[PDB]
Amino acid sequence: ETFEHWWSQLLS
Amino acid sequence: TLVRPKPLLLKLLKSVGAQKDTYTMKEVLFYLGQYIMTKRLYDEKQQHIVYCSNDLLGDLFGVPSFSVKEHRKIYTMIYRNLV
């Protein structure tokens, strides 16, 4: 997965 | 849960367009992600790996790299960098 994909999880 | 970043973390957030001194944790995470992404600090192959050794981020985390998957570690960094 992309950086944005992993990071977006922290905003979930 | 409102937070107040210490000078170094605040410098990082402001560097990506944040214009405030008081943040919710989500805002802090949003702007930290923007900073990592814009400075391309993540590994291109395993994009959850973030290299921060020669960057202001390295001084904040006090580590050379970390994984985006380590949520607790990331939260702990923000918390220690709050006033």
Owner of token pair 């802090």: B28
Instruction: Give the CA radius of gyration of chain B.
Output: 12
Which residues contact residue B48 at a Cβ distance below 8 angstroms, ignoring those fewer than 6 apart?
A1, A3, A6, B42, B67, B68, B69
CB atoms near residue B65 (< 10 Å) = 15
Enter the resolution in angstroms: 1.8
d(CA B19, CA B48): 27
Phi, psi of B66 (to 5 degrees): -160, 170
CA torsion sign, B70 to B62 to B7 to B33? negative
B2-3 and B23-24 beta bridge pairing: antiparallel
| A9 min Cα distance to partner chain B (Å) | 9
How many Å apart are CA B28 and CA B31, to the nearest integer?
5
Binary contact (B74, A7; C-beta < 8 A): no
Of A6, A10, A11, the CB nearest to B47: A6
Q: b/e per residue, B15-44, with b = 16+ CB within 10 A?
A: ebebeeeebeeebbbbbbbbbbbeeebbee
Given a contact cutoff of 8 angstroms between Cβ atoms, the answer to whether B51 and B65 are in contact is yes
- For A3, half-sphere exposure in the C-beta direction (CA atoms, 13 angstrom radius) is 20
For B1-83, CATH gives 1.10.245.10
Q: Is residue A3 classed as helix, strand or coil in its secondary structure?
A: helix
